[PDB]
Each structure stands twice: as structure tokens, then as C-alpha cells.
Amino acid sequence: LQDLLFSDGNVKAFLQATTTDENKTALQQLLVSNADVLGLLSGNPTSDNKINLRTMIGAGVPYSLPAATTTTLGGVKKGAAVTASTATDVATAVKDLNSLITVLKNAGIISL
Amino acid sequence: LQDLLFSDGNVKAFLQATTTDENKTALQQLLVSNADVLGLLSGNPTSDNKINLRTMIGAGVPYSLPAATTTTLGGVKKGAAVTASTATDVATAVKDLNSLITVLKNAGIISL
């Protein structure tokens, strides 16, 4: 009787409660007009759909913290411990300054 | 007449335009074959469905920037201000080096 009453085969499969993946694609298209949402409903959105779906919900991509560069904000590693200076001569004061410089160089806080 | 024409109860509920949550689960299964997409359509995907849905669209999880460790890339906090050195003796030069070391230690740029 459903064959006598309905022409569309995707509708008929829905009414029989047995749909193929192709029937589901067509039925999704009857229910939703946004192309990026249709991409989501397929379970296999295109690259363009993915970008647009994130825009649609205001979502970001997985963020990876980059190392600091001389031009670009980034993360650093924390420098090793450095002892306060008790230098009473120039040679030692210079030794202590250099220890700080190397620590900052080691942590990528300053350039080589 | 629909009772005389169709055997499937979930199809019949669809044709009456009145579906329960159970009818909707069954109708989803007639329309879509991918198990992870069926999880999404339920509104309550399992843990496995969630992982697979993200894979399906190439999405990442919420990213949290970890602190730098000696083995693993991470973020740092920016060090406090440090004055350029005008030291003319060793004691002062060492004092200034140590000030840099403590600043880098305070910001977790180098280890204690």
C-alpha cells in the first residue's frame, strides 16, 4: 500500500523503518538545508565542512603552545636554579653574571 | 489503514508523526549505518563514540597548556623585570647575575 501511496524511494524506506546509507543521505537533505550541517550528519564532513562547523559553534582547533621566538609570543621552559651572588671581587661577580646568562640561554629565554 | 498497510511499529509511528525516543532510536538505525554517528544522533554518545566522532571530523580535545618540564615542551610565565648591570666590581656583578637567576627561577624558566 505504501508503494501505491508514495513515489519517493527514500521516503518509502523511512516509512518501512529500514534505511540504507544512501537513503539516509537523501532523508538528511529533506530535513536540513545547511551544507556544513549535512556534512556533519554524514559522519564524514569535508575539510571545508569542518572549518565551517567550528565557525558555526565558535570552536577552536587543538592548541599547541609554540616556543617563543624573537618575533612571536610563545612559551619558555623555566630556567635552572641560580644562587644569589656573594661576590667581593670583579672576577667572581662576572662568574655569577655569566651563570645567569647561561641559565637563561639553556631555557631558551634568550638567544645564542 | 496504516495498521493494515505497514507491519513495522517504528515506521508506523513516523507515519503518524508521533515518535517516542525508542521509535526515534529505531528510525535512526534505518537511516544511518555508522555506529558512532548513531551515537551522536542519540544525544548521548558513548566514550568510544565521542573519540570516533572527533576522529571522523578531525577535531581535537580542549587543549590545556602544560608548564614546561625538563623533558616536555610547555609554557612558562614571563620573568619579572631585571635592570641592566652597571657593576664596576665583582661583588656587584655577582649580585646582578644572581638577580637574573632568581627571576628565571621565580618564573619557572629554570629549575631549583
Numbering used by the authors:
A (entry chain 7c), B (entry chain 9P): 170 to 281
From the primary publication:
Both 5ʹ ends of the genome are covalently connected to the terminal protein gene product 3 (gp3). ϕ29 infects the Gram-positive Bacillus subtilis cells by injecting the genome–gp3 complex into the host-cell cytoplasm using a short non-contractile tail, leaving the genome emptied virion on the cell surface. Here, we report the cryo-electron microscopy (cryo-EM) structural studies of the ϕ29 prohead, the mature and the genome-emptied virions at near-atomic resolutions up to 3.2 Å.
The total 235 gp8 subunits assemble into a ~520 Å long and 400 Å wide, T = 3, Q = 5 prolate icosahedron of 30 flat hexameric capsomeres and 11 concave pentameric capsomeres. Further analysis showed that the icosahedral end caps of the mature head expanded slightly upon the loading of the genome. However, structural comparisons of individual hexameric and pentameric capsomeres within the icosahedral end caps showed a similar average r.m.s.d. of 0.4 Å, indicating that the expansion in the icosahedral end caps mainly occurs through the rigid-body movements of the capsomeres. As have been shown in the head comparisons, the E loop in contact with the pRNA has an outward shift of ~3 Å in the mature head. In addition, we did not observe any pRNA density in the 3.2 Å mature capsid map.
